[PDB]
Write an enzyme that holds these catalytic residues in place. Structure first.
Site, mmCIF file in Angstrom:
data_model
loop_
_atom_site.group_PDB
_atom_site.id
_atom_site.type_symbol
_atom_site.label_atom_id
_atom_site.label_comp_id
_atom_site.label_asym_id
_atom_site.label_seq_id
_atom_site.Cartn_x
_atom_site.Cartn_y
_atom_site.Cartn_z
ATOM 1 N N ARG A 1 -9.034 4.042 2.836
ATOM 2 C CA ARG A 1 -8.952 2.997 1.859
ATOM 3 C C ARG A 1 -10.326 2.053 1.756
ATOM 4 O O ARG A 1 -11.245 1.542 1.083
ATOM 5 C CB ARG A 1 -7.931 2.305 0.957
ATOM 6 C CG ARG A 1 -7.127 1.972 1.608
ATOM 7 C CD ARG A 1 -6.024 1.111 0.501
ATOM 8 N NE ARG A 1 -5.537 -0.777 0.650
ATOM 9 C CZ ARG A 1 -5.061 -1.255 0.297
ATOM 10 N NH1 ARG A 1 -4.057 -1.054 -0.539
ATOM 11 N NH2 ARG A 1 -5.411 -2.047 0.214
ATOM 12 N N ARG B 1 -0.634 -7.126 6.465
ATOM 13 C CA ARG B 1 0.318 -6.806 6.346
ATOM 14 C C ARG B 1 1.003 -5.358 6.399
ATOM 15 O O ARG B 1 2.023 -5.439 5.323
ATOM 16 C CB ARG B 1 -1.072 -5.857 5.245
ATOM 17 C CG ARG B 1 -1.963 -6.913 4.915
ATOM 18 C CD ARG B 1 -2.761 -5.262 3.778
ATOM 19 N NE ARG B 1 -3.025 -5.044 3.328
ATOM 20 C CZ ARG B 1 -2.686 -4.800 1.433
ATOM 21 N NH1 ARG B 1 -3.000 -5.858 1.198
ATOM 22 N NH2 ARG B 1 -1.928 -3.833 1.218
ATOM 23 N N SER C 1 2.749 0.371 -7.367
ATOM 24 C CA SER C 1 1.548 0.605 -8.167
ATOM 25 C C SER C 1 0.340 1.815 -8.211
ATOM 26 O O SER C 1 0.425 1.356 -9.469
ATOM 27 C CB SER C 1 0.145 -1.003 -7.663
ATOM 28 O OG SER C 1 1.334 -2.034 -7.316
ATOM 29 N N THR C 2 0.118 2.572 -7.622
ATOM 30 C CA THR C 2 -0.009 3.631 -8.302
ATOM 31 C C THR C 2 0.512 4.212 -9.086
ATOM 32 O O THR C 2 0.199 4.915 -10.009
ATOM 33 C CB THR C 2 -1.168 4.486 -6.673
ATOM 34 O OG1 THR C 2 -1.878 3.931 -6.308
ATOM 35 C CG2 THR C 2 -1.623 5.972 -7.629
ATOM 36 N N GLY D 1 0.756 -1.124 -0.186
ATOM 37 C CA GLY D 1 0.321 0.015 -0.655
ATOM 38 C C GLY D 1 0.614 1.207 0.096
ATOM 39 O O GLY D 1 -0.038 2.401 0.424
ATOM 40 N N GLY E 1 2.248 2.554 -2.782
ATOM 41 C CA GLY E 1 1.769 3.625 -4.241
ATOM 42 C C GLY E 1 3.045 2.969 -4.809
ATOM 43 O O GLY E 1 2.897 4.031 -5.918
ATOM 44 N N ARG F 1 -6.930 -19.529 -25.350
ATOM 45 C CA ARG F 1 -7.832 -19.249 -25.788
ATOM 46 C C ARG F 1 -8.704 -19.245 -27.283
ATOM 47 O O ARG F 1 -7.652 -18.000 -27.304
ATOM 48 C CB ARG F 1 -8.807 -18.410 -24.499
#
Length: 194
Positions: free
Chosen positions: A136, A147, A17-18, A13, A15, A43
């Site tokens: 969040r 976490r 990935s943000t 958390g 940041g 597929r």
């Protein structure tokens, strides 16, 4: 030649990935993701080399045991992996391949022949990270302790010398993204000249 890959790590958390999402959206044709191998049946509408490298399970196990994969995992009964060649293929196309892996995964890439730029996006503290995780409104008290503990592990390991090239403290997303661009300014310039 070729732009060096980027290993972006840190707590979930904090940041990373943000910042990567903003990084991918605000750059055209500079950054890219590897095409992953899978044992899954192709597929309909999927083309080999674009969506996945569709390979047989026997081939997958052999290439795993040969050390060809940066990371591999099982999912829905099939196997997936990220091969060095897949990362080197992005570098071959004058693009910056971005690898978002956990702390262990950094160690996997460290032992390989790749030469990426290791970046850790840390929170200002464990308390500030706990505040952001509660805001969040996604966690429970049980998941929060999992976490936080895992985060603390990642923060301790980030202090190891020579591990991460750049460590960004996420005081604010505006400056954190600014420092991430400045760290990659040399590899972005290389991708912008073709």
């Amino acid at each position: 030649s070729g732009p060096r890959p980027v290993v972006l790590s840190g707590p979930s958390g904090a940041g990373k990935s943000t910042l990567l999402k903003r990084l991918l959206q605000e750059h055209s044709g500079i950054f890219g993701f590897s095409v992953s191998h899978t044992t899954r049946n192709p597929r309909p509408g999927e083309e080999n080399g674009k969506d996945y490298y569709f390979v047989t399970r026997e081939v997958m196990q052999r290439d795993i045991a040969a050390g060809d994969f940066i990371e591999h995992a099982e999912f829905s009964g099939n196997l997936y992996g990220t091969s060095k060649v897949a990362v080197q293929a992005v570098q071959a196309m004058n693009r910056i391949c971005v690898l978002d892996v956990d702390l262990q995964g950094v160690r996997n890439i460290k032992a390989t022949d790749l030469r990426p730029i290791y970046i850790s996006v840390q929170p200002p503290s464990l308390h500030v990270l706990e505040q952001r995780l509660r805001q969040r409104n996604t966690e429970t008290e049980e998941s929060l302790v999992k976490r936080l503990a895992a985060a603390q592990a990642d923060m301790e390991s980030s202090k190891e010398p020579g591990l991460f090239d750049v460590v960004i403290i996420n005081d604010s997303l505006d400056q954190a993204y600014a420092e991430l661009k400045e760290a990659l300014s040399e590899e972005i310039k290389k991708a912008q000249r073709t």
